[PDB]
Amino acid sequence: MAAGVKQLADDRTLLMAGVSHDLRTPLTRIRLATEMMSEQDGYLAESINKDIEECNAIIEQFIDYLR
Amino acid sequence: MAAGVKQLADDRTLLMAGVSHDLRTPLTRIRLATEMMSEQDGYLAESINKDIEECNAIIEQFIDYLR
């Protein structure tokens, strides 16, 4: 295949296992951190897992221009 | 200037204001969320602002191959 392409792939799988793999370990430790005060004020606990949901949206929106 | 370049810039300033701008709003809300249990266990509070410090390191290391 003649074309010359070295920056048109390996980004969707490299951006998840690349950044996610590391940003996924902090929500777990803090899962229990906020889970503790999640009783005196469950609010925080969800405020975390929620920022995580937005973390997945930002990854697909910022990856939309990395193909 | 003859060369043809459309993917060799606008990435360092587009990756900070691009991703940071959004990932910086969750540490503030949680700044107070964990700040609450930061007394019954300040540990968590720092566990957050710390993941943030690593958030800046990961951005410069993942940006090192985006020039």
UniProtKB/Swiss-Prot annotation, chains A, B:
Post-translational modification comment from the UniProt entry: Autophosphorylated. Incubation of isolated EnvZ C-terminal fragment (residues 180-450) with increasing levels of NaCl or sucrose increases its autophosphorylation.
Knockout consequences: No expression of OmpC or OmpF during growth at 0% sucrose, low expression of OmpF at 15% sucrose. Single deletion of envZ has no OmpC or OmpF at 0% sucrose, low levels of OmpC and very low levels of OmpF at 15% sucrose. Deletion of both ompR and envZ leads to loss of both OmpC and OmpF expression at 0% and 15% sucrose.
Residue numbers carrying Phosphohistidine: 21
Induction conditions: Part of the ompR-envZ operon.
Binding annotation for ATP: 21
Subunit structure comment from the entry: Homodimer. Interacts with MzrA.
Domain comment quoted from the record: The periplasmic domain interacts with MzrA. The periplasmic domain assumes a PDC sensor fold. The HAMP domain by itself is intrinsically disordered. The cytoplasmic dimerization domain (CDD, residues 223-289) forms an osmosensitive core; increasing osmolarity stabilizes this segment, enhancing its autophosphorylation rate and consequently, downstream phosphotransfer to OmpR and signaling. The autophosphorylation activity of the CDD is inhibited by the angucycline antibiotic waldiomycin which probably binds to it.
Full protein name: Sensor histidine kinase EnvZ
Organism: Escherichia coli (strain K12)
Gene: envZ
